[PDB]
């Protein structure tokens, strides 16, 4: 059948699949209590998107729709959501939330923009800084709406609106930025459904390997770390290719094209995440031109060379 | 043994290659004296990026560097530019400007963000709305810097800075948004060099075909039209495949995958643009699931079926 493959891309040629920024580095994490269950950046090796994952790098943590009402609370502006491609969002579809929805606890700062339609100054526009807190009790993207904190309540209308993210931050002391804690997609006291499954190493001495970005923050010292299991370009490539997976684990080798040598090897699991044989937190030291290349399908008995 | 091919992607699955937003529609333009010489979104069919074109959708109209000084002018804050991947920018490289630089006259609004390094509060961050006018006399990206208009002169430091674009507008009455007028990459009274070449129809009855987006604007009625010659995913695909061009013209067909039928055909020229047989401005009426499919290499005399 069609052979499986990776796109040939250096790290600075990769886009984070959980926030619309480039990858900065590879990082391997010590095993711990976290049950990694991100919903953006999820795609099997045979090309099945999962979670809230869609194809467009610009759709990640973006919202599209219509502002339809306001409330007298912090999260003032009620934004009825559409799908990012403009279609009507169906709250009964088997997804956790609209595709592109942020998959972490925290505040996402960026800008809202509007372009009127209809009878009231059609085609008139505006834009301003805004903030969306995935802690907000009005953050109910699964039900079809989120509420925006904006910076200028008097230059804003009940009109088609888009949110463009720029960075993240802790919200306050009691509500920190937790990249591995999912938001309550349906609001407070409700539980999530249709989730892509948790991810964990399952072989002695293996650790998850992440594509890491340091995304912008808006005050204080948060490093803005967002880790994705596979980068957006891999997801896009697997979707195009739809190559049948010949086993549960694709062996992949990080290679220096200038020398032709392999730097280290890793397990790329059929559900779309990577493990490496290493113990301890470690920012990987690798050359700038390095890239993964697909080697072969291996069985469960395969032991990774230590990295 | 890599054959030439297009990725399989609907319009709403395509990213504009001249502004970080999805494609909204396909548009064919009446033949003007218009010089189309855009510098983002330029790539030959065999995978040669040209102009200011880079691979990441998040890098389009983005800047990265360090703010080093302020001046007592409109464009106050001097931003010394790095390449978007962090490497030092080389003003003698054979490119018109750093890759990603905006390629139009207008104002680009967005947000600047900072993260200190060194001895002064390392790790502290901040972010705010900013504007970069490509009419500015201090818009000299080829030379290594642009100056920023920002919104809060007191919460800004001489620290590593990134610019995230959000939308565009006219700057003022005398300096409108003109997507087909290149900025002076080297400043006033200096001419551009290292440009991707201009494109235009070169066959009777043929017109350019654009992937069009309506990007956000910040006030007034500007429609926010940015047309690109090929979408960013085609560029990323051609770069991966680097299939040699067997002739100067690729015959491509727009197909409805549900019905298997061809909706219309077009010429995909070697330098990375599309013509169709049509007279008049026409936003194309096509089904939402449509996509192009490479059909064959044709020669110079090939006459397109009218569209």
């Amino acid at each position, epitope marked *: 059948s069609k052979p499986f493959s990776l796109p040939i891309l250096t790290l600075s040629e990769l886009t984070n699949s959980r926030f619309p920024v480039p990858i900065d580095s590879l990082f391997t994490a010590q095993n711990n209590v976290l049950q990694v269950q991100c919903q953006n950046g999820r795609c099997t090796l045979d090309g099945e998107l999962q979670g809230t994952t869609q194809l467009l790098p610009t759709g990640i943590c973006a919202f599209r729709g219509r502002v339809t009402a306001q409330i007298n609370q912090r999260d003032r502006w009620h934004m009825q959501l559409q799908n990012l491609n403009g279609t009507t969002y169906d709250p009964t579809d088997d997804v956790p939330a609209p595709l592109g929805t942020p998959d972490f606890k925290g*505040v996402v700062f960026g800008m809202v923009s509007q372009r009127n339609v209809g009878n009231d100054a059609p085609g008139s526009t505006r834009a301003q*800084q805004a903030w969306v807190s995935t802690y907000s009790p009005q953050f109910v993207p699964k039900l079809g709406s989120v509420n925006l*904190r904006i910076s200028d309540n008097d230059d804003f209308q009940f009109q088609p609106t888009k949110f463009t993210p720029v960075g993240v931050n*802790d*919200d306050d*002391d009691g509500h920190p930025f937790r990249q591995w804690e999912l938001p309550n997609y349906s609001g407070e006291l409700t539980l999530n459904m249709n989730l892509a499954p948790p991810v964990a190493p399952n072989f002695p001495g293996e650790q998850l390997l992440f594509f890491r970005s340091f995304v912008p923050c808006s*005050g204080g010292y948060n490093q803005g770390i967002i880790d994705c299991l596979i980068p957006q370009e891999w997801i896009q490539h697997f979707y195009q290719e739809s190559a049948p997976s010949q086993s549960d684990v694709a062996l992949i080798r990080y290679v220096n094209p200038d020398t032709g040598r392999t730097l280290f090897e890793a397990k790329l699991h059929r559900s779309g995440y990577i493990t490496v044989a290493h113990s301890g937190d470690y920012p990987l030291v690798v050359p700038a031109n390095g890239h993964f290349r697909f080697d072969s399908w291996v069985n469960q008995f395969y032991s990774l060379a230590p990295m | 043994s890599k054959p030439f091919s297009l990725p399989i992607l609907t319009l709403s699955e395509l990213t504009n290659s001249r502004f970080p937003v999805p494609i909204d529609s396909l548009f064919t333009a009446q033949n003007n004296v218009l010089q189309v010489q855009c510098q983002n979104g330029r790539c030959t069919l065999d995978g040669e990026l040209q102009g200011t074109t880079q691979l990441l959708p998040t890098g389009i109209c983005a800047f990265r560097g360090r703010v080093t000084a302020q001046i007592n002018q409109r464009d106050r804050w001097h931003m010394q530019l790095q390449n978007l991947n962090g490497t030092t920018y080389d003003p003698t490289d054979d490119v018109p400007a750093p890759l990603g630089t905006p390629d139009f006259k207008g104002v680009v609004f967005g947000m600047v963000s900072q993260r200190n390094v060194g001895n002064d509060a390392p790790g502290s961050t901040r972010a705010q709305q900013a504007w970069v006018s490509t009419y500015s006399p201090q818009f000299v990206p080829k030379l290594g810097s642009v100056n920023l208009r920002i919104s809060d002169n007191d*919460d800004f430091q*001489f620290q590593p800075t990134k610019f995230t674009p959000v939308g565009v507008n006219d700057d003022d009455d005398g300096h409108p948004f003109r997507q087909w007028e290149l900025p002076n990459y080297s400043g006033e009274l200096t001419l551009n060099m290292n440009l991707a070449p201009p494109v235009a129809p070169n066959f009777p009855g043929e017109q350019l075909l654009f992937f069009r987006s309506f990007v956000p604007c910040s006030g007034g009625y500007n429609q926010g039209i940015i047309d690109c010659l090929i979408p960013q995913e085609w560029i990323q695909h051609f770069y991966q495949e680097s299939a040699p061009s067997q002739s100067d013209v690729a015959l491509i067909r727009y197909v409805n995958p549900d019905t298997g039928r061809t909706l219309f055909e077009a010429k995909l020229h070697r330098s990375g643009y599309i013509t169709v047989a049509h007279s008049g401005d026409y936003p194309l009426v096509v089904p939402a699931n449509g996509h192009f499919r490479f059909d064959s290499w044709v020669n110079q005399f090939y006459s397109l079926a009218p569209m």
Partner: nanobody
Amino acid sequence: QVQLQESGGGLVQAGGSLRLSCTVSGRTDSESTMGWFRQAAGKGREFVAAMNWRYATTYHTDSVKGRFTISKDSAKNTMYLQMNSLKPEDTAVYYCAHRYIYGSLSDSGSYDNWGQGTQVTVS
């Protein structure tokens, strides 16, 4: 419009404590946000801590989170900054600021009004 004035700074030895005070007056509503900043000689203004005037919800940056505590005496119209385990790096002029926007408490920007500042020198 909101008017602010800091107080309580001075010379102190490394290890001691101070309690800065920031008195507030003027129109202040539900989303009014009050923050502390500091600027050492020749360096950039550093965001330190912020609170929501109404509910006293707080954000502290990680460089001070163990040692400094923002707080509000709601009886009076006075914000505070409890500065413990002071080190010479804490030397700076401390400012307080008001912002009509909620934003996020972690957001260092869009602060409109400012007090004149009090000097804090750690020896």
